[model samples]
Target: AQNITARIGEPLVLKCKGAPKKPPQRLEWKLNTGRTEAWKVLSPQGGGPWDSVARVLPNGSLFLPAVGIQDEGIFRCQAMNRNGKETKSNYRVRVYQIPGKPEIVDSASELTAGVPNKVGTCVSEGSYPAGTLSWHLDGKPLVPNEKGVSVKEQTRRHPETGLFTLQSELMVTPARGGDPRPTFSCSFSPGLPRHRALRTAPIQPRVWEPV
Candidate 1:
């Protein structure tokens, strides 16, 4: 499988490699999204929904201007020579966008000792190809193995824009007489090609008085 990455609102070309020595008598492009009868022929014969954004080249490459999340999928090319011999290739295209700055929303400014606190929710919105959410405490990464701390993450896609929104919740209970104002942070990365990463401003956790 050929992997491809395209930026939002940019032009991208998916080349069909291993073309026959001579131009094939017929060339066809199709899209498959892992559904039955969902194959969409892209070229030779026009009038398809993707015609507005996709253009077929003589060599069977596909040109896309202003690619979006909906454009992410597997593309197949089939070439047939005069002798009925055929060659086929497949490509997996992934479209991604840099997400907005992450935001940290603390449930409360103070927490009670020995009582689980819904510390805060870290949110990264309007990203394509999804994104990963990570939490840090005093510059140290927090993972599931940490005791007395739990994390939950949820992702949702906007139906119209095809962009994803990621939210991660941090739950913890501060030990008695521990650091009074521990620092917390959230980091988001779209990862690779884009290599875009963002982190929220450091947050100081407060402990409730007389807890």
Candidate 2:
């Protein structure tokens, strides 16, 4: 008896054995999805056999390179030997989908000039693998100001489903008046290849009247 669970687009494996220390008459595999159907046989002689459904190893283990949602259902295996007949066992396979892209949630899109000076926060939306976030200016990393800039760590949650996500923010005090524009950018990386991105915008530091 074995319990099976897997995620779609992920690899999976299944294993079973016979009894009486002897081979059975026939080993059958079937997928029960409301309607019973023949399970594409992989190996018949208890040896390695490559098939579309799964790859049967020499030790009678079934290997699924990438399982799919459709693969979820009940599976049965039958083993029969010369003396009489015996059924191996039955099992269930469950597959689920991965979480979608994450989103960044914050306030103030573009910097504005007004009372108390405008403080803008920029955030990134839509990413996976707990994307890493950083800030840069003039092609160099931006350092947290002694008392000006406020940086907050990113976070993610799925609540009930247990899905994963993340979001990060960078706070800046925009230049007010007569101040030249400075180069600023937010860089995001999924900590993996092909999923990284960067965004930049020019801004003038907030200017304040003599206090």
Candidate 3:
């Protein structure tokens, strides 16, 4: 068995490990529907034509044209030898990715010291496993409730697709520790190596403080 992760709407392939050097007369691919005594046959018996959902190639590899959150499950491939010996392989697939960069909405026009004003709202939509969001100030991590910062967040799941939409609003009270034209930005959790380039938005608002 193998563990794999895939991006949404991307092509994916799963090779059968049960295949032997000698070509087998028959092979099968099955999908577990999570119910006992129930399995969906994926591939045709005689290696027939391809389908929009998935198909088994000549080499007994399963090809999925596009992967969605609903397709996240275990896939099994079976091969049989001339003597009726059977070999089975299994793979688990997961989906994770954000469609585009986060957007900065409801931007601020001015800033003041000792007064927490709205910076902007950051929104990341249609992502599996609900994206984690954080605020950044002048290229530095801005911890919530620290340095007079206020971060409010909302998470909603798309009704049809079952993906998550993450919304975060940042409010900060400017201080003399940074530049007058400080910048604020937010991004998704980049913990995984594959998500290093996750999208973010930076907006530099004017500074004006009067006692």
Candidate 4:
């Protein structure tokens, strides 16, 4: 079984290995979703009625020009050699949508040293499969509850588009004689092979100096 992922509106190839050394007499491809089943035969024959969105190559690989959400399913490839022996391979396809850049919002414009808590929120909208959000400070990863800091995450889905919106909050109390002004950033990861994980612009929160 092969597990593969593809982005929306992109081309993808589902490879099928284990073909006989000699040319296979017949090759067949199918899609199964538990509720529905569709199959087509290729090689030594012609196109079937269900042969439009996908094509089978001589090597028994399935090619999809543009993939969509509906294309996600289990794909099966079967090959039969001259000896009438059959071999089958299964592929699991998953589709994901790229996320937009993260935006950071802070409740207080200025943070006081050793005082009340300040809150910051990071948000990214219109993504599929939900993504993760992480906090960074001074170009380094920030640990939750470290140095009087804490972070929490939340996610919501759009009813119409079936996409996700992620939000993360950070609460911290400034310390005296530190960086004075530390840069805070939020990073988002939608998945692998699709996006490199985007980060928000660095924000330097003002720290009030003791009089």
Superposition-based RMSD of candidate 2 using all C-alpha atoms, in angstroms: 10.3
Candidate rank order under lDDT: 1, 3, 4, 2
How does candidate 4 fare on TM-score? 0.75
TM-score for each candidate, following the candidate numbering = 0.78, 0.41, 0.80, 0.75
Predicted model with the maximum TM-score: 3
lDDT of each: 0.78, 0.51, 0.76, 0.75
lDDT of 1 by residue, 7-123 (tens): 889998876655444444377778864321577787654566666778776666777777776677888888775556677888888877888899998555777767678888999
lDDT per residue (tens digit) for residues 1-211 in model 3: 6888888789998887656544444778887632213676864433433376777776778888988876778889887755578888888887776546788899897777667889999988877777588888878889887778888999999888887888999998887545679888888873244566454767989888656
Question: Which of 1 and 2 is ahead in TM-score?
Answer: 1
**lDDT tens digits by residue: candidate 2, 150-175:** 57665664454333354446665544
- Displacement of residue 109 (Cα, Å) in model 2 is 7.0
lDDT of 1: 0.78
RMSD of each: 3.5, 10.3, 3.5, 4.1
Q: List the residue pairs that clash in candidate 3.
A: none
Clash counts for the predictions, in order: 0, 14, 0, 0
**Over 4 Å off in model 4, which ranges?**
15-27, 33-65
Weakest ten-residue segment in model 1 by summed lDDT: 16-25
Residue-level lDDT tens digits of model 4 in 1-211: 6888888778987766556544444776777642245543444234764355676765667777877766778888777755577778888888899778999886457787886455589999988778789988888888876678887788999887778899899888677877777888889977655768799988777888767
What is candidate 4's CA lDDT for residue 70?
A: 64
Residue 75, model 2, lDDT: 65
Cα deviation of 31 in candidate 3 (Å)?
Answer: 2.0
Q: Is candidate 2 or 4 superior in lDDT? A: 4
